[PDB]
Amino acid sequence: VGIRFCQECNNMLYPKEDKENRILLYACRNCDYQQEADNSCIYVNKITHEVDELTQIIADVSQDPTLPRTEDHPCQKCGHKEAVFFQSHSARAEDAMRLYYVCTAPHCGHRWTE
Amino acid sequence: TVINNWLLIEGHTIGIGDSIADSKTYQDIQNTIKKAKQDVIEVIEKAH
Numbered sequence: 001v002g003i004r005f006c007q008e009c010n011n012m013l014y015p016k017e018d019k020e021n022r023i024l025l026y027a028c029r030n031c032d033y034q035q036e037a038d039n040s041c042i043y044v045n046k047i048t049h050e051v052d053e054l055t056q057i058i059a060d061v062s063q064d065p066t067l068p069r070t071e072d073h074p075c076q077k078c079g080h081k082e083a084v085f086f087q088s089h090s091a092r093a094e095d096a097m098r099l100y101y102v103c104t105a106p107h108c109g110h111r112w113t114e
Numbered sequence: 115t116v117i118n119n120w121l122l123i124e125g126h127t128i129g130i131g132d133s134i135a136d137s138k139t140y141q142d143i144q145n146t147i148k149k150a151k152q153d154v155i156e157v158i159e160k161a162h
């Protein structure tokens with residue numbers, strides 16, 4: 001999945017085949033540094049990719065004066081009443097109007113979606 | 115010619131009295147507008 005780098009030349013490690021022990025080795029093209037990986041999966045491609053933005057929503061959006069606010073949706077963690085909300089705010093989304101919420105209490109930053 | 119010289123008797127105009135409605139009509143229009151805005155709000159709530 002991710003990119004792993006050689007410790008000698010600090011270049012990308014390409015996958016190379018070990019035709020003796022039937023094992024996967026990551027080797028670079030600059031030096032002869034070898035490795036054994038734990039992912040065991042070279043490549044992964046998901047075409048749905050309906051990523052939940054709760055990973056990508058920052059908790060600092062609560063300081064936006066231009067966002068709507070509601071008090072009928074208390075925070076799950078700290079029980080604070082006021083909570084900002086907004087829409088998906090994502091391009092390349094075929095169809096979405098679901099709301100997202102962020103707690104406005106400082107240092108809480110709870111970001112959920114009912 | 116005939117209609118113009120007769121129109122010199124009847125006359126024609128356009129004014130605010132011709133562009134103003136009645137109180138009952140104003141109430142009807144405002145009611146309809148409020149109902150439509152409420153329905154739009156309901157649709158938005160269902161979408162959310």
Ligand SMILES: [Zn+2]
Binds near residue numbers: 006007010011029030
């Ligand atoms: Zn290397």
Ligand SMILES: [Zn+2]
Binds near residue numbers: 079103105109
């Ligand atoms: Zn909270």
